[PDB]
Amino acid sequence: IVPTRELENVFLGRCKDYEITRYLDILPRVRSDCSALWKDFFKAFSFKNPCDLDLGSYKDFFTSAQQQLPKNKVMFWSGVYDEAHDYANTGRKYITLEDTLPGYMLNSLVWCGQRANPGFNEKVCPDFKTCPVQARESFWGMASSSYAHSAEGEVTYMVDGSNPKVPAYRPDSFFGKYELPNLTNKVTRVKVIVLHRLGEKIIEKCGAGSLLDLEKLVKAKHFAFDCVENPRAVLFLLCSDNPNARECRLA
Template identity: 40%
Template sequence: NYNFNYITLEDTLAAAMVTSLTWCGKDNDAEWFHYVSCPNDCKDNIGADDPFWGIASKTFAQKFVGEIYLVLNGSQSNDRPSFRNNSFFARYELPNLQRKGPYRVTKLNVLRLHSPDQKVVEKCGENSLITLHTIVRSYQIEYLCKDDPEELILIMCSYEWEARECQLERQVLRKEWNQKLLRKSNSSYHSVSFLFLIFLLLILPKK
């Protein structure tokens, strides 16, 4: 639907500038950061990015209005649940959704995706999604969960073109597209034939 714009936190200017950066915290230091070096295996890195991303997530969530969308992975490695109480969404965004006034969140749409050729760990209405549903409804916010919406499957398959599920999707899409093209082609053919027949009737000598 071209009337909707989907924006993630990483799409904002401030977040885009620091996405994928390695944060180096430094305990017992007034500046709290390593400015000289930043080894990737530095044990002090753990949680160093929490202050920034925590405040960013909270502020971002407070700006949500109306109907919002949450995309969750239903094929997490190690059978991890899609919704986790220690995630940034659970800690900083979900509790800070506006629940009152004209600029409140009215509905949360959960889009559950399952990665091609990977195990299905959870589906809508199961396990951690039941917990999420309960929390959202306690906020007086409408809740809807949908497994593998078609528009997102097409996006996933653009990256996993050779996956088994995507090959099946391609076959169906190709068949439908060919039918569309064929009908258009036949329609054009009949239109041209009809015009040609009229032309012949006009130029042929009348007896």
């Protein structure tokens, strides 16, 4: 895969932009300056083979970059990027990982280390399917773990209930592996939103299948649980992008 060009400049530009101008009324600023954050980020993977990472590699970076998160507003999502982010709406209704400082800085970027100077590979990064799972998931797994650990109150989880090949809830997704296990006693309820894509066959429904498994896990952690399928607010967003869908017929 192709690494992002000028990684340091993009990281530092996004960091400064975020610092001074983004999410000012939703997320607090962190204590560390952008250069200190770059040093913590770079040392996690630099001067090592591209697959020499595990869940602790970016530990310092994430500790330094973690923000306190707004109560009742944290959202997790699996297999529904556009829909979840369109619904959260850049932190106005819910916050997603990609709205936090670390998620904003590295979203969509590609990078990897190498042992030879300059310590990172500017020409090519592995198909990651070539790296073991703990390495492949080193950054985003730790991002998701730190994010979930800071969640408070009600949390929302949006999932795809229309994918015949991937259940709505799975223990090996980032949510199953890194977020649910790190929700603390500060969380009080897991609110699931099941997206039923317009025009496609419904695969998963609340109260059945993997959603029933999720419900049991949530309750075992003493949290409340609720689940809804295409709640109106979400359905209207789907309809805005496909207004002639049968599901969008008006009275």
